[PDB]
UniProtKB/TrEMBL annotation:
The chain holds residues 2528 to 2787 of 3427 of the full protein. It comes from the Viruses. The lineage of its organism: Viruses, Riboviria, Orthornavirae, Kitrinoviricota, Flasuviricetes. It is found in: Host endoplasmic reticulum membrane; Host nucleus; Secreted; Virion membrane. Residues 1-260 form the MRNA cap 0-1 NS5-type MT domain. It comes from Ntaya virus. This is Genome polyprotein. S-adenosyl-L-methionine binds at S51, G81, W82, T99, K100, D126, V127, Y215.
Amino acid sequence: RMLGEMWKAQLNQLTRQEFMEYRRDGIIEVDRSAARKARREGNVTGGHPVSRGTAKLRWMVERGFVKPHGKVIDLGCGRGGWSYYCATLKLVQEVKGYTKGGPGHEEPVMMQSYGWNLVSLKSGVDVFYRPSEQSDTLLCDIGEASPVPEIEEARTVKVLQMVEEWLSRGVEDFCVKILCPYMPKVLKELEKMQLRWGGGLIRVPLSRNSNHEMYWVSGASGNITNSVNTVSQMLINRMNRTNRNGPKYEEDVHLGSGTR
Ligand SMILES: Nc1nc2c(ncn2[C@@H]2O[C@H](COP(=O)(O)OP(=O)(O)OP(=O)(O)O)[C@@H](O)[C@H]2O)c(=O)[nH]1
Ligand SMILES: Nc1ncnc2c1ncn2[C@@H]1O[C@H](CSCC[C@H](N)C(=O)O)[C@@H](O)[C@H]1O
Ligand SMILES: [Mg+2]
């Protein structure tokens, strides 16, 4: 058994009060109070990201793990945090985002962040049955949590099988959420996809301790098993501390306004 399986089992055994004290202990968290207000007041020009996802992709882009450029396709775009962020980037020319929407799913939000006119978000799209398209940059942020690791395993494998089809359509840069990177079917599939397409797995420190999500990104490298175990050991070490401090707060991304 991978160390991550022990982590998931230990996580599920926490009391609710332990879980709540653990999930954000020592992580980085952007202050979203101003953005949440702007969403309630319909402020689309203040530069506030539509979701917490913008800060996560910004973290990866600023360290060179992915380099959005040209035509960007954003699979599972939700409200559009990754898509609007990419449209602010100089090398990016066009952004197409697809998301399922509907009951219990996030709907695309229309924003006027810098470059908004380059962004087309389409709701009502199940990407698992959508024909693939050409892109220069492929992003995918799909993976619904479950307390059952085999369910997270199956969901992650489906994303990987879907992104295999899209990666063969001319993709130069990519960033794909790996919801459950420690289970055997995911590790087997990731290793084959790393052999074919390269890249490596990274942990964004804005990810909460209540998940083991990692990102398979074209600008990273390194042994996948080692990368996963490193995360698992860090998450277990955090779980086994009693003196909790909550998150380290940082400033959210500013996306500006105006057309490009
Ligand atoms: N012990 C314990 N584990 C939980 C609890 N809620 C969720 N989990 C575990 O944590 C995983 C992530 O749950 P989430 O609800 O997505 O995590 P979260 O940090 O609470 O994030 P948000 O609910 O979106 O604010 C689940 O798949 C479970 O394995 C809980 O109340 N107690
Ligand atoms: N089968 C499917 N087809 C298209 N979108 C899906 C999907 N299953 C889940 N999703 C969507 O994928 C999204 C992942 S959340 C993505 C957050 C985004 N990166 C941001 O920054 O705002 C969810 O909104 C979910 O509704
Ligand atoms: Mg929760």
